[PDB]
């Protein structure tokens, strides 16, 4: 279950990074779409502690489509 089972650690190592926090998460098996929503709790930590994170995806069986960043302490991932 490479889709479901990778949530959790995925949540933690995000929430563990000094500066940011997983705000919102959505999964639809039918549409195969994992929408993530990461937020800032600082002032430029969403770019710094981020480049790193796209090494974490693509070491299991990934799903990465787009990644929108709109500086409303806002970063919208899709693992579809």
């Amino acid at each position: 279950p490479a889709l479901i089972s990778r949530l959790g650690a995925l949540q933690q190592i995000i929430d563990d990074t000094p500066g940011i926090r997983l705000r919102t998460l959505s999964f639809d098996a039918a549409r195969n779409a994992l929408q993530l929503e990461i937020s800032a709790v600082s002032s430029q930590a969403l770019e710094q502690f981020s480049q790193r994170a796209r090494a974490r995806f693509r070491v299991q069986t990934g799903e990465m489509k787009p990644r929108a960043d709109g500086i409303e302490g806002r970063l919208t991932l899709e693992g579809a």
Binding site: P1, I4, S5, L7, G8, Q11, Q12, D15, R21, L22, R23, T24, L25, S26, F27, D28, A29, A30
Partner: protein, 77 residues
């Protein structure tokens, strides 16, 4: 017996089910604010028992670091 296994495992992971309403082969669940890790452990356990997560939408509780509200949750056999 699907509802029973869902509820027994829920209790085993510290979670509280409030609503358990079928659509058909799928059950729409309403769940109280939960530790996200516990939620996943629970769903993963259910996955091993043949009920897979069809839909899941959660939002972080802003003042509680590991916790989420469960907005949507639908299981399917």
């Amino acid at each position: 017996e699907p509802s029973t296994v869902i509820m027994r495992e829920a209790a085993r992971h510290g979670l509280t089910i409030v609503r358990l309403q079928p659509q058909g082969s799928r059950l729409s669940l309403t769940v109280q604010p939960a530790d996200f890790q516990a939620l996943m452990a629970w769903l993963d356990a259910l996955g091993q028992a043949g009920m897979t997560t069809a839909t899941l939408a959660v939002t972080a509780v802003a003042q509680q670091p590991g916790w989420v509200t469960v907005n949507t949750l639908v299981l399917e056999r």
